[PDB]
Amino acid sequence: QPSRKEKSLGLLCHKFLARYPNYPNPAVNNDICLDEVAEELNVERRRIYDIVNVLESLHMVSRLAKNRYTWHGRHNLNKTLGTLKSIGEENKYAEQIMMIKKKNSRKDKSLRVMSQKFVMLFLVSTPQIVSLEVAAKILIGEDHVEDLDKSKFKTKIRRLYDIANVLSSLDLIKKVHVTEERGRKP
DNA sequence: TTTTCCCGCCAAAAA
DNA sequence: TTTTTGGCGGGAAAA
Known part of the structure; x- marks a missing residue:
């Protein structure tokens, strides 16, 4: 219990x-x-x-x-990650890690889209993560003068945790320390 | 102590 | 209206 x-x-x-x-x-x-x-x-x-x-x-x-x-299944998987690579704004993400390291519809909204951009950011020559990617979720999510800081970002950490452990079940992810990266199927 | 994240209120899309 | 779909944060167990 x-x-x-x-x-x-x-x-x-x-x-x-x-x-x-x-x-x-x-x-x-x-x-x-x-x-x-x-x-x-x-x-x-x-x-x-x-x-x-x-x-x-x-x-x-x-x-x-x-x-x-x-239920469908595992068919598109690789085609989905590759089409996400066609959608990928990878240079903006890696540049965003360079920032953090030191110094359609308006309300689609956040769940499936954030999981999709998460699966997109997973591919890189140097897998890096992850609360920095939450800051990427704040920048893509807001991009305005407010900020509106303190709040909001923690809840994105919560739903990102749900996306994390839900992606830990017989799928393409690891259990490495904190801020994890794995994509078993290319 | 901080990080991890469950439970469920409550409101937007459907019915 | 009631129903189904989910944001959204609090608040506490777990590391």
């Missing part, structure tokens, strides 16, 4: 990846998030919401209808 890991996002995420094969074929494929809430004794739907939203940021899954997702 006392342990906080029993309700950690990476447990139910590991079970979520256990629910479906990484390499399926077009069969009777469907997802019902409330049926996931009922098939086990947990949890509140918001957890499956953020897990599903981060899952579709890499095109691993797709929306079909209300309470109706399709």
Whole structure:
């Protein structure tokens, strides 16, 4: 009971990846998030919401209808990271680390897009990370006189933590100290 | 002590 | 309206 890991996002995420094969074929494929809430004794739907939203940021899954997702799988993965490299503003990111090191729709908004730009920034000759990339999220997110500092940035650290441990479950990431980098599949 | 991050209020898109 | 989808921060367990 006392342990906080029993309700950690990476447990139910590991079970979520256990629910479906990484390499399926077009069969009777469907997802019902409330049926996931009922098939086990947990949890509140918001957890499956953020897990599903981060899952579709890499095109691993797709929306079909209300309470109706399709699992798809590992096919696009490499094509998704490569298309993200076509979208990549990598020079702005590496230059942003040079700054921090010393001295469509307006409200899309932040979840899937931040996971996408995270997966984009993961590729570089010298993988560097990660709260500096949170500062990149503040600069891309604001780029205005306010600032509006102190607040906001910590919550981006929180959702970035959720993106971190959710990407720690049978996927392309490591567990190295803090500020981690891995992309197993090129 | 700081870092890690869960729970869930509460409000925007759908129904 | 009620419902489904998720931002958003607090507040505490864990390192």
